[PDB]
Design an enzyme around this catalytic site. Structure first.
Site, short mmCIF file in Angstrom:
data_model
loop_
_atom_site.label_atom_id
_atom_site.label_comp_id
_atom_site.label_asym_id
_atom_site.label_seq_id
_atom_site.Cartn_x
_atom_site.Cartn_y
_atom_site.Cartn_z
N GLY A 1 1.29 5.55 11.10
CA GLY A 1 2.71 5.95 11.22
C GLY A 1 3.61 4.76 11.49
N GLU B 1 0.97 -8.41 0.70
CA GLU B 1 1.15 -7.02 1.22
C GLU B 1 2.63 -6.67 1.40
OE1 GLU B 1 -1.24 -5.10 0.92
OE2 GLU B 1 -0.36 -3.26 1.82
N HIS C 1 0.82 -1.25 0.00
CA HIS C 1 0.00 0.00 0.00
C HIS C 1 0.84 1.29 0.00
CE1 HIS C 1 0.08 -0.51 4.53
NE2 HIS C 1 0.22 0.80 4.47
N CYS D 1 3.37 1.76 9.90
CA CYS D 1 3.39 0.81 8.76
C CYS D 1 4.81 0.73 8.24
CB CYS D 1 2.36 1.08 7.66
SG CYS D 1 0.68 0.61 8.20
C1 LIG Z 1 -9.55 -5.67 10.27
O1 LIG Z 1 -9.50 -4.24 10.03
C2 LIG Z 1 -8.77 -3.84 9.00
O2 LIG Z 1 -8.60 -4.48 8.03
C3 LIG Z 1 -8.21 -2.47 9.23
N1 LIG Z 1 -7.65 -1.93 8.01
C4 LIG Z 1 -6.33 -1.70 7.90
O3 LIG Z 1 -5.53 -1.95 8.80
C5 LIG Z 1 -5.89 -1.10 6.61
C6 LIG Z 1 -4.59 -1.11 6.07
C7 LIG Z 1 -4.69 -0.42 4.92
C8 LIG Z 1 -3.72 0.00 3.88
O4 LIG Z 1 -5.97 -0.03 4.73
N2 LIG Z 1 -6.75 -0.47 5.84
#
Ligand SMILES: COC(=O)CNC(=O)c1cc(C)on1
Ligand SMILES: COC(=O)CNC(=O)c1cc(C)on1
Length: 182
Positions: free
Chosen positions: A146, A72, A41, A148
């Protein structure tokens, strides 16, 4: 404070750079030669900033498993004048669970940050930002925007990079030795 933080610090001080893309500033782990990793991402392009130096990207590959499912992890080869210390011998060979992990971050926003995240679960399949993702590691820490690309270590192993959270748990993509055979 202890041997977990000692191993984590040794990795941060020699094997991390600050990577900037159009999607922000990320902790980036250098693995060997001019090869590093970052969360997919981050949307790596033809040019990336490395410690605020304009740097050509020689090659970038968004990894997927043999089910053609997102992992990812993007592997980046950098047009940099200096090699990373080779840390491939600290990468696990297999998917596994771990005790007593540290998540380490180094950016302009979060310099020299070390978080004891504790037990790490081989969670496997997760819907990450709407994207089906495999080989996800989970730990019970309220990680934030921050962190990631932050490095997940145990004593003696570099096991993942932080890719998300839900406010209660944090999520990392596994690093496996097989990703970096040359
Ligand atoms: C279970 O909850 C999730 O999936 C939360 N979402 C993320 O952490 C996330 C990472 C990125 C890029 O976009 N969203
Ligand atoms: C903690 O609850 C979960 O959803 C964990 N899932 C598994 O047990 C699992 C997935 C894979 C791959 O290997 N074990």
């Amino acid at each position: 404070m202890g041997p977990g933080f000692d191993f984590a610090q040794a990795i941060m001080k020699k094997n991390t750079v600050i990577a900037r893309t159009e999607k922000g500033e990320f902790t980036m782990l250098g693995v060997y030669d001019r090869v590093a990793v970052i969360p997919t991402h981050a949307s790596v392009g033809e040019i990336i900033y490395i410690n605020d130096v304009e740097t050509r990207v020689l090659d970038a590959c968004a990894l997927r498993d043999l089910t053609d499912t997102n992992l990812e992890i993007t592997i980046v080869k950098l047009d940099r004048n200096q090699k990373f210390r080779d840390i491939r011998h600290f990468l696990p060979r297999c998917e596994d669970d771990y005790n007593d992990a540290v998540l380490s971050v180094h950016t302009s926003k979060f310099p020299n940050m070390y978080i004891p995240v504790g037990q790490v679960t081989n969670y496997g399949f997760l819907n990450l930002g709407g994207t089906p993702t495999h080989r996800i590691l989970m730990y019970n820490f309220p990680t934030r925007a921050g962190q990631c690309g932050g490095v997940v270590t145990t004593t003696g192993k570099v096991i993942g990079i932080h890719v998300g959270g839900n406010g209660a748990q944090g999520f990392a993509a596994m690093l496996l030795h097989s990703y970096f055979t040359d």
